[PDB]
Amino acid sequence: GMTTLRTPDGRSLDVALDGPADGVPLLFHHGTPGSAVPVRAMQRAATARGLRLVTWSRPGYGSSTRRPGRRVVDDADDVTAVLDHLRAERCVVAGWSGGGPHALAGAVRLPDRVAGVLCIAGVAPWDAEGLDLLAGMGEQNVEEFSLAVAGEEGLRPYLEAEAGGLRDADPAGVVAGLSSLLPAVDVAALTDEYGEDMAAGMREALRTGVDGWLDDDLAFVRGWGFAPEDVAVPVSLWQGADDLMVPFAHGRWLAAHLPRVSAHLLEGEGHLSVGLGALDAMLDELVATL
Template identity: 55%
Template sequence: MTILSLPDGRSLEYLVDGPADGLPLVLHNGTPSAASLYPPIVTAAARHGLRVVTTSRPGYAGSTPQPGRTVASVAADVTALLDALGADRFLTVGWSGGGPHALACATLLPGRCAAAATIAGVAPYDAEGLDWSAGMGAENVEEFGAAVAGPEPLSAYLESQVPALAGVRGDQVAAALGDLVSEVDTNALTDAFADYTAGMFRAAVSSGIAGWRDDDLAFVRDWGFDLADVETPVAIWQGAQDRMVPFDHGRWLAAHVPGATVHLDEAEGHLSLVITAFDDIVADLATHR
């Protein structure tokens, strides 16, 4: 784990893994999360000549909170990190709550961001024609209902969830996620992937709820950029068996991100899609390097 000192005085925690001369693949993990890498993801990226770079967004683990941040705020942090790594260009992928952050990079860093992909990425809360919470598991409906109500109700809700994640083990993850996991995702939560997921959840709440809270608030507010302005190549990947980010989010993004390449899979879920499709996702991104 490495700490970068940002121009505004904040600290940004990050990890880099893969070939030293590889083009950076900036990975935006979901919500809640922290800088953590699943080895098969690193291996898949390396096969395509890419090194994976991931951060703990502000407020998570060793990264300084940034109250009031928007989704767009990520672009400045990614820019500072790439400058520190001496990288002029990069690819990016965002999973779940990381999806909007990948789209922010694609929109706000044209030219430098060669291509982006979202995996089960959430759509804007005010997306026209989308019933945003329809099909979500009960836990997400409650969580984002609290986010819409404001910082205080949201903080109270998240604090109540911390004990379940702070000590979670791999064999407990599926139960901890409750109504958020479909059958295909429950089946995916085994062995090393379950241990990785549990470790990421523990790290996500290791310094409190600031990162989780500010992620949720950013999702239900204006993102700070317009998807209609995307000029960077973007691929949308979404599974129909997803109770965290429902299928309609992927369909909405597919229809509203200009020029998007669309991969909608009826058989996959929120977690299983990462396991089964990540090599294909990276292979597609690498064609734009």
């Protein structure tokens, strides 16, 4: 259930902490936008493997104190604070989408505590050599990233206009709000329990405004503060060919730059469907790093 953790710099983090109380932590880094609202399918898959699912809202999402100017790597301060709260020597970590860079960061910060990374449709570094980051992206994401590069003053009112349609959205509302970004396989994923969980995640992400979404976007268009080459632990990398939010080429790029990577490039899968259908295979590979 939900708890609050005070960090050393005086911030509060909203933390969703599952049992089992003695399990190895699985730290799940949420997407952009996203929050500490667990996906029930991920809870069931984690508990089946004896993993203790832990997620926190990144600064500015939900009731987590905004931390303006944060880089991707600054999230690893909170990884360390959370694992110290749990008294956990070792963990595995997973990140989806905007969570992918943050999951990798924790591995670089804590190379002897993080055993392995699961990176699901993770976004590539903004200066990724030889990659056109915006190529294959849905036009909503091209617009958002172009505003992010231009700065907070133009990005904020854009995100506030998008948030109008998403802050109270049910699953149908999330589909309507992401029109350019979802292929049919992703729309089909946002039904039933997964859709309810993702919509609840989106509502909590936007409950106190767009600050977490804004600060994530601004972080993704600057230096992460580390390179994928610095991630020494095994990475299980997954990417859908039909993803319009993080194009296939981003996962191909990350797979080429990570030193120890199992790469899975799934035909017919999008940004949402990749995680939903492959969760058992993803967690089997992650747990094998322990």
